[PDB]
Amino acid sequence: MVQFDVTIEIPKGQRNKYEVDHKTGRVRLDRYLYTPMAYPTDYGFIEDTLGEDGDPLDALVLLPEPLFPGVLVEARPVGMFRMVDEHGGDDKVLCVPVNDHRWDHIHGIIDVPTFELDAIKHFFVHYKDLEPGKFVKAADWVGRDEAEAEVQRSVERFKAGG
Amino acid sequence: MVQFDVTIEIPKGQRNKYEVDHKTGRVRLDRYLYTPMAYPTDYGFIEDTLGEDGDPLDALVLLPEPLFPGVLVEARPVGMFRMVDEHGGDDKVLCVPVNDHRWDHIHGIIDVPTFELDAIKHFFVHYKDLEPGKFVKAADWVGRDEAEAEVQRSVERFKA
Amino acid sequence: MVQFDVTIEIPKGQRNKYEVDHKTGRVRLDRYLYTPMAYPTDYGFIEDTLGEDGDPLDALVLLPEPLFPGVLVEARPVGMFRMVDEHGGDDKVLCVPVNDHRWDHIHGIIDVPTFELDAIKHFFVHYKDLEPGKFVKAADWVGRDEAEAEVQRSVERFKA
Amino acid sequence: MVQFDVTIEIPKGQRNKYEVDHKTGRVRLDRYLYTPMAYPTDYGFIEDTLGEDGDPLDALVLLPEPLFPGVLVEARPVGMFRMVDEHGGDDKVLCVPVNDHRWDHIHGIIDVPTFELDAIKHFFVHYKDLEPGKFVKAADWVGRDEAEAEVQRSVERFKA
Amino acid sequence: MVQFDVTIEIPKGQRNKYEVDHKTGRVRLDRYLYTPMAYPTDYGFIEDTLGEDGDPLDALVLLPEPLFPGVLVEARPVGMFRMVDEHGGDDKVLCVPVNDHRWDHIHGIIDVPTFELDAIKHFFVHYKDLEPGKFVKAADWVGRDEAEAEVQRSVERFKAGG
Amino acid sequence: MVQFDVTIEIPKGQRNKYEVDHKTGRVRLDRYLYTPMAYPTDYGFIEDTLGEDGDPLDALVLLPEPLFPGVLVEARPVGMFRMVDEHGGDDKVLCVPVNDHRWDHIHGIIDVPTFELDAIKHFFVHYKDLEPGKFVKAADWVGRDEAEAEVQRSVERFKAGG
Numbered sequence: 001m002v003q004f005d006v007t008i009e010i011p012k013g014q015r016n017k018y019e020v021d022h023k024t025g026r027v028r029l030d031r032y033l034y035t036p037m038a039y040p041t042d043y044g045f046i047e048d049t050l051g052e053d054g055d056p057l058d059a060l061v062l063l064p065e066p067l068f069p070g071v072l073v074e075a076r077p078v079g080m081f082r083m084v085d086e087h088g089g090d091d092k093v094l095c096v097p098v099n100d101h102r103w104d105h106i107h108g109i110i111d112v113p114t115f116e117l118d119a120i121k122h123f124f125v126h127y128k129d130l131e132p133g134k135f136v137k138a139a140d141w142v143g144r145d146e147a148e149a150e151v152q153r154s155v156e157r158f159k160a161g162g
Numbered sequence: 163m164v165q166f167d168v169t170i171e172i173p174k175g176q177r178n179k180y181e182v183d184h185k186t187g188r189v190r191l192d193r194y195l196y197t198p199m200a201y202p203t204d205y206g207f208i209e210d211t212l213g214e215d216g217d218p219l220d221a222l223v224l225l226p227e228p229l230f231p232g233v234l235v236e237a238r239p240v241g242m243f244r245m246v247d248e249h250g251g252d253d254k255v256l257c258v259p260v261n262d263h264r265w266d267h268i269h270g271i272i273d274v275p276t277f278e279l280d281a282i283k284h285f286f287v288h289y290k291d292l293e294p295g296k297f298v299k300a301a302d303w304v305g306r307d308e309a310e311a312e313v314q315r316s317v318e319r320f321k322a
Numbered sequence: 323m324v325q326f327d328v329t330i331e332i333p334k335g336q337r338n339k340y341e342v343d344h345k346t347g348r349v350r351l352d353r354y355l356y357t358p359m360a361y362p363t364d365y366g367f368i369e370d371t372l373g374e375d376g377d378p379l380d381a382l383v384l385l386p387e388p389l390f391p392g393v394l395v396e397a398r399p400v401g402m403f404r405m406v407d408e409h410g411g412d413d414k415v416l417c418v419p420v421n422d423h424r425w426d427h428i429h430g431i432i433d434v435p436t437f438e439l440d441a442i443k444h445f446f447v448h449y450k451d452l453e454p455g456k457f458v459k460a461a462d463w464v465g466r467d468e469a470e471a472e473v474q475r476s477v478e479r480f481k482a
Numbered sequence: 483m484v485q486f487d488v489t490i491e492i493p494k495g496q497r498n499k500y501e502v503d504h505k506t507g508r509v510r511l512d513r514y515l516y517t518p519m520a521y522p523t524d525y526g527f528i529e530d531t532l533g534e535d536g537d538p539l540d541a542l543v544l545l546p547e548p549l550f551p552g553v554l555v556e557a558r559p560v561g562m563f564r565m566v567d568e569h570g571g572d573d574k575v576l577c578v579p580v581n582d583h584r585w586d587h588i589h590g591i592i593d594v595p596t597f598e599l600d601a602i603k604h605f606f607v608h609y610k611d612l613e614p615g616k617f618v619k620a621a622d623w624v625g626r627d628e629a630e631a632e633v634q635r636s637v638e639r640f641k642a
Numbered sequence: 643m644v645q646f647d648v649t650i651e652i653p654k655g656q657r658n659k660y661e662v663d664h665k666t667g668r669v670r671l672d673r674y675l676y677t678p679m680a681y682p683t684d685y686g687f688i689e690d691t692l693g694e695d696g697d698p699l700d701a702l703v704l705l706p707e708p709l710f711p712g713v714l715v716e717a718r719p720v721g722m723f724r725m726v727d728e729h730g731g732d733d734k735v736l737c738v739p740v741n742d743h744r745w746d747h748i749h750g751i752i753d754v755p756t757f758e759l760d761a762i763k764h765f766f767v768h769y770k771d772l773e774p775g776k777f778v779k780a781a782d783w784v785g786r787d788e789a790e791a792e793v794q795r796s797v798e799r800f801k802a803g804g
Numbered sequence: 805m806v807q808f809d810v811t812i813e814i815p816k817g818q819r820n821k822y823e824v825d826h827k828t829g830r831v832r833l834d835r836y837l838y839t840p841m842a843y844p845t846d847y848g849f850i851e852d853t854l855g856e857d858g859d860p861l862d863a864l865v866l867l868p869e870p871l872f873p874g875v876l877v878e879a880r881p882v883g884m885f886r887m888v889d890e891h892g893g894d895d896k897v898l899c900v901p902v903n904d905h906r907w908d909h910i911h912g913i914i915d916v917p918t919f920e921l922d923a924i925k926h927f928f929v930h931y932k933d934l935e936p937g938k939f940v941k942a943a944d945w946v947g948r949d950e951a952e953a954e955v956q957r958s959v960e961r962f963k964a965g966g
Binding site: 705706707709710712713714715716739741742744 | 819820822825830831832833835836838872873874
Binding site: 337356357358359360361362437440441442444445448451452 | 657680682757764765768772
């Protein structure tokens with residue numbers, strides 16, 4: 001069973017887009033969203049990963065209640081949101097907390113209610129609609145096998161980068 | 163100097179869509195939104211008006227902090243949001259609290275920052291995107307003169 | 323397809339125990355809980371029912387976000403919590419909002435996760451532990467058929 | 483053992499100043515405070531009283547957690563805050579919830595910590611500092627005997 | 643007058659059980675409680691202490707309003723909650739902030755209202771009721787002298803461990 | 805255009821007075837306010853500055869929604885609140901976030917609504933009214949040029965201190 005640590009940057013329900021500066025460890029405000037939308041899940045990144053674009057792999061964590069920026073949660077992948085925007089491809093691994101029987105019945109993307117996947121998709125498709133020169137050309141969901149393959153590639157890129 | 167009472171149905175920042183039952187006065191949950199969006203202003207209706215569709219005229223109230231459902235606020239119009247959806251036309255009057263010097267500089271639609279008007283528009287254009295059979299085909303803003311003309315039509319329509 | 327209106331008294335997550343005075347319609351603070359616990363669901367009563375004890379039938383409503391005291395929500399029964407305390411028997415109907423596809427998979431008590439039923443039970447078993455003379459001697463769950471039978475008895479008891 | 487019902491208008495910690503319209507029962511937004519201050523207690527009025535100025539007698543209720551506007555709480559007086567502002571005299575009865583052992587040690591004004599009385603005073607002395615034409619010239623505390631005498635005058639004034 | 647620094651892990655009113663990883667300094671989500679209960683006080687640990695079980699001594703801090711995970715508060719002990727669970731004995735020192743006249747009248751456990759002690763006891767007796775293989779065999783309160791003796795033992799264990 | 809990093813200590817709306825210990829980086833509770841007031845803006849300090857009194861220069865940041873203690877925001881100065889209290893002079897630089905068109909129209913103190921400046925002044929004039937031996941003798945506002953001059957002096961003092 002693949003599992004890993006996710007650092008939360010943005011609690012569910014927030015309109016402030018926080019980001020961890022990976023050089024310093026500091027939490028920074030990127031910006032307050034320009035749209036009347038709020039993050040649909042807790043949002044952050046997988047520790048010890050490196051995506052194709054130089055930053056760690058993004059993670060979305062399903063949780064009963066929001067966390068605080070900077071908090072670590074041990075999690076396991078169930079699928080992956082993929083999108084194409086102004087900086088090209090962007091993937092976000094969808095995760096649930098490990099060692100919690102309340103999530104035991106969610107083994108893969110097929111187990112996650114469609115209305116929840118659709119809400120998360122809608123957020124990422126629209127949240128930058130009022131930001132000039134930002135766009136989304138494509139967005140879809142893939143399952144746990146493909147999420148794990150991407151996690152593995154990013155773990156490999158992390159190790160190769162030093 | 164047009165002014166009126168607004169009953170708030172939905173506080174700013176809420177994802178629960180409350181509505182007042184106008185035949186009982188009860189506050190009901192209509193639905194929880196299917197989209198990850200939140201009401202961009204306090205939202206409700208103008209007391210003693212009747213729109214083209216039989217409900218009181220909707221109102222959006224700019225405020226420093228959100229209210230509670232059922233609360234009355236005396237307000238004045240600065241403009242009007244108009245849209246066309248699955249039910250046809252819909253107007254929502256944009257308002258600011260009266261006799262509050264902090265809003266005295268806002269006389270009309272040109273005085274409301276574009277980024278704020280664009281955010282309000284974005285909410286109404288997209289908030290029903292995930293509801294089968296619902297849609298928004300057009301949405302725009304008109305000024306205070308047009309808003310007051312609509313309020314006046316709605317007030318007379320109430321009287322008749 | 324049994325459905326009814328629920329008036330919410332107490333939002334999920336609250337430690338203030340509000341109650342509606344059924345002779346006036348006012349919302350009153352009963353008490354702040356003496357235990358470090360919070361209501362596990364939105365909590366209220368079914369409009370136009372009368373229980374065995376003279377009050378409307380209590381209802382627990384599963385919702386994505388809590389409501390406000392006094393708010394009406396149209397709901398359908400999926401099961402019923404039963405308990406015995408210092409006043410004798412008490413039933414609370416477990417409900418989900420109607421005409422909301424997000425709840426369409428929940429048809430009966432077997433469809434509600436055990437961990438959620440256990441949490442609701444734990445609240446009612448313990449929330450009065452620190453009140454002299456109050457106690458809970460037994461608590462259990464029954465299914466949708468039993469819940470609808472109790473709603474029907476309560477509706478007729480209201481009519482009579 | 484004097485006790486009465488208090489309707490809460492403004493929850494503790496709020497910067498929105500709500501008021502009940504006593505001729506309709508509606509809750510209205512009076513104003514958002516112009517000062518960076520927040521109500522130090524739950525704030526409202528005593529039902530079935532009439533002050534010297536024609537409004538019900540104001541009440542401050544000490545509670546572990548704030549309520550919602552319009553909520554009723556059965557309370558007992560422990561003292562009274564008095565002030566003089568632009569409208570002349572104003573009294574606010576300081577109260578604690580009845581039949582709650584957690585407040586049984588609070589019998590009168592001497593039982594309320596000085597730091598808490600000083601904070602409440604500071605709020606009423608300063609909350610209108612940034613409103614032209616408004617002022618507070620004097621403010622003080624009196625004990626439970628004086629509070630009950632004022633409640634009694636207000637109750638009779640209501641009856642007459 | 644004994645005083646010390648408490649790092650808060652869990653704000654009063656929360657149902658998320660956060661914990662500081664003492665090796666790394668990171669705040670982690672342990673778990674969301676399985677019971678409909680919420681922490682009755684701000685909850686954390688005494689810096690520079692070591693309990694018998696290898697972790698710093700736990701602290702409960704009485705405060706007018708909750709803090710954030712990771713925040714330091716200078717505090718003084720007024721008593722100690724003692725319990726016996728599945729890992730044996732567990733003590734939690736009850737504290738108030740120092741240099742604050744609003745707490746000056748609380749010198750010991752006898753000064754703390756009984757209903758508040760009973761609520762805190764009820765939380766620790768019941769909060770793991772729905773977690774299999776977790777239990778509580780005993781729970782009680784002792785006073786300031788005994789709290790200070792335990793604080794001193796833990797300070798001593800801290801120093802002996804390195 | 806002068807810009808700098810502000811670390812937030814106290815979110816707008818709070819009555820807990822948090823402070824960063826500049827030696828350790830830890831966020832500490834200083835105290836809960838004794839007055840029924842709440843911070844009128846997000847409040848903190850400018851990184852890499854040193855005031856005359858030995859601490860970094862204080863900053864007030866205008867924001868649509870409050871942040872969390874410890875969060876960095878890149879900001880630009882629009883004016884400065886000056887006051888004289890029990891420790892003598894104290895200045896707080898008023899700032900807006902950079903690279904955000906929603907604040908583009910605020911170039912200086914003259915652009916900030918008077919009612920907002922008056923509310924911020926009232927807070928600092930009164931928030932210590934119930935703390936014995938604390939007082940305020942003077943308080944006023946100066947504009948962006950004078951804010952930038954003070955920022956520059958504090959940057960210079962920072963560099964001279966090591």
